[PDB]
């Protein structure tokens, strides 16, 4: 089948929010030279507005278009069960031969969270 599904997980509710738009637009542009019948680029984006899971498919004219898969209430996208739900929705709806995931946010290696409850 040669198909592949990639979920891009953007925890953008931070200082990187103004930069999220450019990347998503770059994804559409890059999606142009991608076979959108077998390749599935799904995007979870949680910026300064409500979270949303979309798909960067092509219309019947070949133009890259955003396809809403699911809208979410405001939520902590850095929560495991929230990520689980998005991951589940993303890959179960778009099974493929191969898979990949992109992690888009701030990073600090293995370091524990600076904010914990007890």
């Amino acid at each position: 089948v040669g198909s592949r599904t990639v979920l891009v997980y953007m925890i953008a509710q931070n200082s990187l929010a103004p930069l999220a738009s450019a990347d998503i637009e770059e994804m559409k542009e890059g999606m142009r030279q991608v076979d959108a019948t077998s390749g599935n680029l799904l995007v979870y984006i949680d910026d300064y507005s409500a979270p949303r899971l979309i798909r960067l498919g092509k219309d019947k004219k070949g133009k890259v278009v955003e396809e809403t898969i699911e809208n979410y209430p405001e939520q902590n996208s850095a929560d495991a069960n929230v990520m689980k739900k998005v991951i589940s929705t993303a890959f179960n709806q778009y099974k493929a031969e191969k898979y990949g995931m992109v992690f888009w946010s701030h990073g600090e290696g293995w370091i524990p969270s600076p904010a914990k409850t007890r």
Binding site: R4, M27, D35, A78, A80, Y99, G107
Partner: protein, 245 residues
């Protein structure tokens, strides 16, 4: 940790727990800072085949998704193509940080790809080294060991290979360990220097291999304690060093 949602940050353990509902991934691409760490690679070794990120800071504009997206949908070797695309873009515009900005990134970049399946072999290899060459509890002489962390009040991430080289003085035990490590980093490219939002342009040592590690320090006992929570700690041999035994 990874990800910041307001005042929330996802611990690596929680991230791993979340990725269990995911199918096995060809690649885990972290377009995020400091994620190319041995501790993250090991913790997520069962989630995918390849870990793609930087051991140091990632440029604000991140990946050139106009070329990275096609790289992600390659027939095979997507992980390598993702990394090479990421690197080639910033190396083409590299001008040693002259006129540096988000809209015109001349500060370059560094990208590594780690083979996850070799992380267990690496932990075994490392366990043969650490207790044997770290018998006491004392700050290390880390000159010459590339530090990916340019925040002098933190300095979290050092190059794993250069650290093992330091403590073994590059002897025969290093060569043995080096054999196991060679199977891990399948890609590592960097401009002569990278940009730090904390320190500015900094030199990337030519002998760095692109995978970071933590190193205990007298100044941060709480963080030394936190490191005992990582799964890499439990299998790396650190528990049997003079720092923890």
């Amino acid at each position: 940790w990874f990800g910041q949602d307001g005042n929330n940050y996802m611990d690596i353990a929680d991230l791993h727990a979340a990725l269990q509902v995911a199918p096995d991934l060809d690649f885990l691409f972290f377009d995020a800072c400091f994620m190319e760490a041995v501790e993250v690679a090991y913790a997520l070794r069962d989630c995918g085949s390849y870990l793609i990120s930087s051991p140091t800071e990632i440029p604000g504009p991140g990946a050139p998704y106009q070329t990275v997206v096609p790289a992600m949908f390659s027939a095979e070797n997507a992980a390598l193509k993702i990394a090479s695309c990421y690197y080639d873009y910033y190396q083409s515009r590299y001008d040693d940080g002259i006129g540096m900005s988000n809209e015109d990134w001349t500060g370059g970049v560094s990208v590594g790809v780690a083979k996850m399946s070799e992380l267990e072999n690496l932990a075994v290899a490392t366990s043969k080294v650490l207790p044997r060459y770290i018998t006491g509890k004392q700050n290390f002489d880390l000159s010459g060991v590339m530090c990916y962390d340019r925040r002098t009040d933190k300095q979290y991430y050092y190059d794993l290979d250069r650290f093992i080289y330091q403590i073994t003085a590059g002897n025969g035990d290093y060569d043995s360990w080096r054999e196991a490590f060679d199977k891990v980093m399948v890609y590592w490219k960097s401009t002569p220097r990278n940009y730090s939002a904390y320190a500015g342009m900094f030199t990337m040592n030519q002998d760095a291999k692109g995978l970071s590690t933590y190193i205990p320090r007298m100044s941060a006992p709480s963080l030394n304690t936190s490191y005992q929570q990582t799964e890499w700690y439990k299998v790396s041999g650190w528990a049997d060093t003079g720092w923890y035994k």
